[PDB]
């Protein structure tokens, strides 16, 4: 599932600003 | 309007700033909440009231290595000159040899963040009753001239009342015009900043149906390991929802994500109306939400005055002041 495919990459934590 | 005494008074203020409201003696530095390229945040104690805040240091040298310089000074400015029940409140400035620092009110609740990851996902319900705030929110600094671009859960703090109030105005600006700095965080992009066109306050309202989506369906439109992938997919003209978003949800989204900003909503005729008149917003008292006066689906754990429970632990670090004075001419008006 897409919740997984988020859960799994390493975009889950705090995202800074370019 | 209402809105038009609130430009009375923000221009007041953004016209002759508050400068040196406080110095460093005067807070017993606790705990760090947060960091960042150019400094940190910490839960302070102001020893004469006894009152709680949040100080965010940042490092002169480290903003101007890093051409932040403008954006600092926007920051403050703006921040000492606002006034609205979901923005955070800026008490104390001030500035030292090394550092500049903003005080502002203690919100112990921390980031919308760290609860939309731990629930995972909020019914249409929980998730409109946070837009609403968003949706006055950006009516009230657009109503100024002020275009914000740093919308995202991590800067969305819960009130003790359940309530939002929004940090980081670090990329917030008086534009009455066009901007073209390349800014933000790269899912909330609207494809104007990522295409480096002349762009407007439509990138306000792409970020907030960015919201809206990772709010409802716990993770966001656009994600990618990539920054470069996650572009490719905003600039695309493509989303995809999930089942269970409502179809009043998925029309406001489609809506709100339209790629070509001179057909998405809040950017039209009737601006801000194609919202707040949206089927998706037609249970929402928009006077009700602004008032407080409506229930809160969720007030955080309060374990007291100075609980830092709901912030993540980093190294206590030292606060360093040199004996010298560094990038005086650069900070003149903060
Ligand atoms: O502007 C903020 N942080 C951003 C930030 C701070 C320092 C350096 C940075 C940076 O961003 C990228 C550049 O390096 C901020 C966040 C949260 C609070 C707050 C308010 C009330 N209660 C608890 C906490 C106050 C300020």
Redesign the pocket.
Known sequence: TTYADFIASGRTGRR??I | EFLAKAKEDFLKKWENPAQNTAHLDQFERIKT?????????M?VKHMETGNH??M???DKQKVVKLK?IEHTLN?KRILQAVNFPFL?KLEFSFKDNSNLY?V?????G??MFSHLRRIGRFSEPHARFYAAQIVLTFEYLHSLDLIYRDLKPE?L?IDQQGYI?V????FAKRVKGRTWTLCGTPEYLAPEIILSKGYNKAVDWWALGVLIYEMAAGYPPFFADQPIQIYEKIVSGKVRFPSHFSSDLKDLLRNLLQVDLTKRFGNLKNGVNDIKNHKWFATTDWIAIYQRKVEAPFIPKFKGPGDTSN?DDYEEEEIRVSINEKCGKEFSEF
């Open positions: 800074n600003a | 909440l947060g960091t960042g390229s150019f400094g940190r945040v839960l805040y949040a965010k240091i940042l932040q920051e955070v903003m502002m009110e203690y919100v112990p921390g980031e800067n703090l109030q940090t980081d105005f670090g912030f």
